[PDB]
Amino acid sequence: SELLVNTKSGKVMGTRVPVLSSHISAFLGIPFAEPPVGNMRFRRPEPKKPWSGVWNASTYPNNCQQYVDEQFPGFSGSEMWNPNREMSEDCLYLNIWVPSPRPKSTTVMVWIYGGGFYSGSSTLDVYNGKYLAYTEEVVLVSLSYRVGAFGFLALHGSQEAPGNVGLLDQRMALQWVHDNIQFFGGDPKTVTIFGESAGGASVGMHILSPGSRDLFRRAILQSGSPNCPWASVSVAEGRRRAVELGRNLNCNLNSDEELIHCLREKKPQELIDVEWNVLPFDSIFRFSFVPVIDGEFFPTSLESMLNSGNFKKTQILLGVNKDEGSFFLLYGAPGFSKDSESKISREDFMSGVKLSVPHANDLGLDAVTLQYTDWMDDNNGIKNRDGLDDIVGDHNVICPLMHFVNKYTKFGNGTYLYFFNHRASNLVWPEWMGVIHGYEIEFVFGLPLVKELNYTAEEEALSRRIMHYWATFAKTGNPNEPHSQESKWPLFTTKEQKFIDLNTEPMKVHQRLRVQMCVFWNQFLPKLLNAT
Amino acid sequence: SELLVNTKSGKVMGTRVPVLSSHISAFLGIPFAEPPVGNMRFRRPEPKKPWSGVWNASTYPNNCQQYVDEQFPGFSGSEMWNPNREMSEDCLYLNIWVPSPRPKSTTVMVWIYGGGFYSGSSTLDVYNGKYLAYTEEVVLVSLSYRVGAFGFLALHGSQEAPGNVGLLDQRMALQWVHDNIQFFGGDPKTVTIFGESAGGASVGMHILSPGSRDLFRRAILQSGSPNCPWASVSVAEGRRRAVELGRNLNCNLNSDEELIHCLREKKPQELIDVEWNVLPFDSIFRFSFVPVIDGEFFPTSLESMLNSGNFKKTQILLGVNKDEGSFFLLYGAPGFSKDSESKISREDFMSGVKLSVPHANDLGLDAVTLQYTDWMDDNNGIKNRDGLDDIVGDHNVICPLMHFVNKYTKFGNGTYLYFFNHRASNLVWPEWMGVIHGYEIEFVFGLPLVKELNYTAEEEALSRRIMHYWATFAKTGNPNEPHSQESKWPLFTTKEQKFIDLNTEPMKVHQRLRVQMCVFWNQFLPKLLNAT
Ligand SMILES: O/N=C/c1cccc[n+]1CCCCCCC[n+]1ccccc1/C=N/O
Ligand SMILES: O/N=C/c1cccc[n+]1CCCCCCC[n+]1ccccc1/C=N/O
Ligand SMILES: *[C@@H]1O[C@H](CO)[C@@H](O)[C@H](O)[C@H]1NC(C)=O
Ligand SMILES: *[C@@H]1O[C@H](CO)[C@@H](O)[C@H](O)[C@H]1NC(C)=O
């Protein structure tokens, strides 16, 4: 049977799924680890005990325990990101979409979900791997990993809650793919890991970490890089937040062993309810439990690793969206709201700057304000709104990705950079938010090919073109087909720093993506904060 | 006789001078002070002893002792600024141009020469008052004052060299005008003091200083303001430079009395030869002997005076030129020269920044560089050249004048601001220097009306229009003729901050003159330097 596969862990039984009036196989909900419950909460993942008999892989698994967005109930815009299955701490599963008939050795892509390390599910409609698998004839995997305190509570020195275990969750899933994907027709020699947001930063983290490098071939990063200011913390800061979390739930705090035990007796929701109370500053685009610079997973600091060339050398394809910041300002910054144009007063603009750069002294805050204020027209509500959108996007996502890409290219074997700026015709969010964090994903997964979702024809064409770029890059290390008449996405080089737009218009090459602002975030401001 | 005038100091005999195929009277070389020679070197001026008989006022007087530009011998561009008479320490004289027939009570304008407080003469061709006097029917005075160490050597606490005596030279000349100009047909109630560069800053200084306010009615400032970073020093810094000057000439340094005596035995040229050796930094647009913040002439610091409204309240007309910096970079900055386009390398640009902001730490220098660098095109020789031109202009002249004008307007009785950007058709300096420091003066004094000087017709028209603005403002406090059909130079206000261009094209109003750069020089950078 095409739906029966014998792996090293035991036999799995999948299901036939319809896609664009054809069909393909899906193996959903395969475990790659022992359920991390009870005394194994906060702990490193263990490999899954092999099973006898046939594992039923016909339905999606549980989503990991996580915060649930309730700002706009019934609103698809926010709820498309929420878990669509029951939540459980028993959530370490992966899903596979396989072409029909079964391939022998074809290119593999493994997806890693975003969600600020505090949220995410492999099972969301926008992550459905069937269109990609079917259209490009690739084996599509989607993994899962613990988020929140469950994934990232860090008491360094203690082996009961070391930190980074959600990254090791990802690593164990890549190990399983390495080991077994051949039985599904995947080529273990040609695995591309890709991810958006925290998943993009995760991809970058596996590139850096020695323990992860050998388990994938190449990598795509969407709107995220490992050096993002929100993607990691020192061991001291992690310790502090873990202690404060215990302080919020009335734990004994005299020893690591006392704290951890107390935290293990709590029900999942008690941890989720107080999770946001541990942040050190009044901030946006900051998350409580994130990867920690521990000296095991990351041997030294991220910057010294990037300078010395201490990372996997291979091809990378990556980029950003036009308006990365709007999602975050909407939720947290005064003056912004979903159903108005959100024209921002000068007073709200400055409140905005404070929340967006929480770690900055007064001089730093002035430096930023000056850099994004048009002093000819300082009380223009639209210019204030958009400038603050640009600040949050540049600081959090674009300038950290640009620092990474410039550093990586010095040592790497080929870089391809994009700037995604198509505003989708059917977007439910308001005009002012622009091209939002996470809204390139639907084009990457081929949702525009489904007619009932109401995209234009040129949006279908864009989606196909992006899928073929992504898949051709996974297959060869180059998104272009050599010998074809279409426009050439040029290689990014240290010298010329070229990149393309991704949108419905004929492609354009440009150079030095937001260099004037990123010299400010990546060189000047940090120097200013170190002197003062 | 029309050429004989009886003043309070004694009788004066002038001369009839031809102008634009008519004639007028000129009283040249009238003394207003005792010659400041011998023991009176470095000292406050004394009033001139009245004379019996008739003072011959038919020829220009001596120019004060000063440094003489020799960079381009025979080149009119540089030599038009040099002294055209014999130099002497016996130089305290003034000159008067009077319409024919003699007026009774008409508007008076008294000119104060620039030259960085280290140079200047009342007697230069470009300062010839006859065209202005004749064309607008005003009595035109031009004064003189000691420059260099002779005018500004400052040993505070000592009455032998107190500092600021060159400003008191100006004050005594304004006193003489107050007292006597009526006998020449001038209205002592309607005196306008005007000046360029150090003379513009001087004008501003008489507005601030209590001792000077009552001696003039209103004021014009061209490319200079009292708060310019080069226009004054602390008493400690003045003391240091006076000591270092004495150290350069082998003086006994054990007491003020010893130093001053030693300096008084030296010939003028010995002081001039070592004058530049006392500057604290490697710099441009900085001068050795300048006004000192002494607590007598200036009661408190310039900034506290500007904040509290401690100054004469009256009308002011003022402005700047497009390319104020080029003159200074030519003379002192590596990569610039008179006979090339002076395209500047990135390395020379940074050398430039260091010399232009000599008092800044490394963080400050970076802040400036970032602000004036296009990071898309950082090795564009023209953009580097022009950016450095703009830095020197903005820091030295434009942003300090803009801070002054904004502060003054809060308390003042009417402000009129211009931006002069006509590149003269007959200019001998190269294209790259643009609209240079000091090249609006020729339009103010009417040289374009003389055919043999080879200006265009529209340049004649511009000159006349500027002269009539200047003269109508001196007469009424408003450069416009109410009830006339010509375009209206609008009042500058705290709210709307309006200003005009001065050039051959139809006038345009704009707002907030170089506000984006001047917020940087006047707010951010000083705050950055105070924290670090
Ligand atoms: O961090 N990445 C999140 C993500 C990534 C891809 C797609 C969708 N998202 C949902 C994030 C939008 C809303 C941000 C919500 C942050 N937040 C959560 C809980 C409580 C408060 C807040 C923010 N307060 O300002
Ligand atoms: O300060 N204002 C001077 C002025 C004003 C109106 C018209 C003409 N000028 C001549 C100044 C140009 C050249 C600057 C010369 C400065 N300088 C003098 C002596 C020795 C060295 C230097 C400069 N070295 O970099
Ligand atoms: C990648 O590496 C191969 C083999 O080592 C080399 O020949 C090629 O030039 C490299 N490509 C780039 C873009 O560096
Ligand atoms: C100047 O002062 C006069 C008289 O005090 C006043 O009436 C007039 O409004 C003032 N003008 C300005 C521009 O402030």
Alpha helices in A424-507 (DSSP H): 441-444, 457-476
Q: Is the CB of A381 under 6 A from ligand 3?
A: no
Give B483's contacts (C-beta < 8 A, 6+ positions apart). Answer: none
Residue with tokens 């028209």: B461
Query: What is the atom index within ligand 2 of the atom nearest the CA of B276?
Result: 20
Taking an 8 Å Cβ-Cβ cutoff, which residues of chain A contact chain B?
363, 366-367, 370, 374-376, 511-512, 515-516, 519-520, 523-524, 527-528, 531-532
User: Residue A326 CA: which ligand is closest?
Assistant: 1
Evaluate the CA torsion angle B312, B313, B314, B315 in order and state its sign. Answer: positive
B212 in active site: no
Residue with tokens 């009539």: B468
Q: Which residues line the pocket of ligand 1, CB cutoff 6 A?
A: A 67, 81, 114-116, 197, 276, 284, 327-328, 331-332, 437-438
3-state secondary structure of A203: helix
CA distances from B66 to A191, B61, B268 (A): 79, 15, 9
Residue with tokens 């059909």: B485
* CA dist., res. A77 & res. B420, Å (int): 55
The resolution, in Å, is 2.5
Which tokens sit at B131? 């065209």
- The partner residues of A418 in beta bridges, in order of sequence, read A319, A500
Taking an 8 Å Cβ-Cβ cutoff, which residues of chain B contact chain A?
363, 366-367, 370, 374-376, 511-512, 515-516, 519-520, 523-524, 527-528, 531-532
Give phi and psi for B196, each to the nearest 5. -115, 145
Q: Is the CB of B6 under 6 A from ligand 4?
A: no
* CA dist., res. A503 & res. A512, Å (int): 19
Give phi and psi for B235, each to the nearest 5. -65, -35
Beta strands in A386-505 (DSSP E): 415-420, 498-502
Question: Inter-chain contact B531–A363, Cβ cutoff 8 Å?
Answer: yes
- A-B contacts at Cβ under 8 angstroms: 45
Q: Are B401 and B224 in contact (CB under 8 A)?
A: yes
Q: Are A227 and A202 in contact (CB under 8 A)?
A: no
Alpha helices in B148-222 (DSSP H): 148-152, 165-180, 198-208
Q: Which of A363, A376, A520 sits opposite B370 (nearest CB)?
A: A520
Q: Select from A393, A438, A149 the least CA-distant residue to A276.
A: A149
Burial of residue B508 (CB within 10 Å: 0-12, 13-18, 19+) is: exposed
Total count of domains within chain A = 1
Mutate to test the interface with A, among B361, B365, B372, B375 (most CBs of A within 10 A): B375
Evaluate the CA torsion angle B177, B182, B183, B184 in order and state its sign. Answer: positive
- The partner residues of B355 in beta bridges, in order of sequence, read none
| Bond preceding residue A101 cis, omega within 30 of 0 | yes
Q: Are B237 and B280 in contact (CB under 8 A)?
A: yes
Beta strands in A40-181 (DSSP E): 54-56, 63-64, 87-88, 93-98, 106-112, 139-142
* CA dist., res. B406 & res. B495, Å (int): 10
* CA dist., res. B89 & res. B113, Å (int): 17
Question: Inter-chain contact A363–B528, Cβ cutoff 8 Å?
Answer: yes
Which tokens sit at B133? 């006097």
B422 in active site: no
Alpha helices in A284-398 (DSSP H): 302-308, 326-332, 346-356, 362-372, 381-393
Mutate to test the interface with A, among B374, B376, B383, B529 (most CBs of A within 10 A): B376
Angstroms from B364 CA to nearest CA on chain A: 9
3-state secondary structure of A80: coil
Assign residue A511 the CATH number of its domain.
Answer: 3.40.50.1820
Rounded to 10°, the helix A346-356/A381-393 angle is 0
Q: Are B501 and B418 in contact (CB under 8 A)?
A: yes
B121 in active site: no
* CA dist., res. A320 & res. A341, Å (int): 24
Q: Select from A245, A224, A187 the least CA-distant residue to A42.
A: A245
* CA dist., res. B10 & res. B54, Å (int): 7
Residue with tokens 């400055």: A350
| Bond preceding residue B101 cis, omega within 30 of 0 | yes
Give B255's contacts (C-beta < 8 A, 6+ positions apart). Answer: none
User: Residue A429 CA: which ligand is closest?
Assistant: 1
Question: Inter-chain contact A363–B511, Cβ cutoff 8 Å?
Answer: no
Annotate A133-148 with b (16+ C-beta within 10 A) or e (fewer). bbbbebbbbbbbbbbb
- The partner residues of B140 in beta bridges, in order of sequence, read B97, B109
Which tokens sit at A193? 């890991």
CA distances from B450 to A95, A102, B189, B455 (A): 90, 95, 32, 8
DSSP letter string, B70-91: -SSTT-HHHHTTS--S-EES--
Count CA atoms closer than 13 A to A214's CA, side-chain side: 4
What is the separation, in whole angstroms, between the first and last Cα of chain B? Answer: 68
* CA dist., res. B344 & res. B384, Å (int): 6
* CA dist., res. A509 & res. A489, Å (int): 8
The four Cα atoms B452, B456, B459, B463 give a dihedral, to 10 degrees, of: 20
DSSP letter string, B153-174: ---TT-SSS-S-HHHHHHHHHH
Q: Select from A10, A519, A108, A74 the least CA-distant residue to B373.
A: A519
Give B1's contacts (C-beta < 8 A, 6+ positions apart). Answer: none
Which tokens sit at A130? 């069937």
Q: Is the CB of A414 under 6 A from ligand 3?
A: yes
Alpha helices in A215-255 (DSSP H): 235-248
Technique employed here was: X-ray
Q: Are A195 and A170 in contact (CB under 8 A)?
A: no
Q: A511 to chain B: nearest residue by CA?
A: B376
Domain of A502, in residue numbers: 1-532
Give phi and psi for B87, each to the nearest 5. -85, 145
Give phi and psi for A274, each to the nearest 5. -110, 0
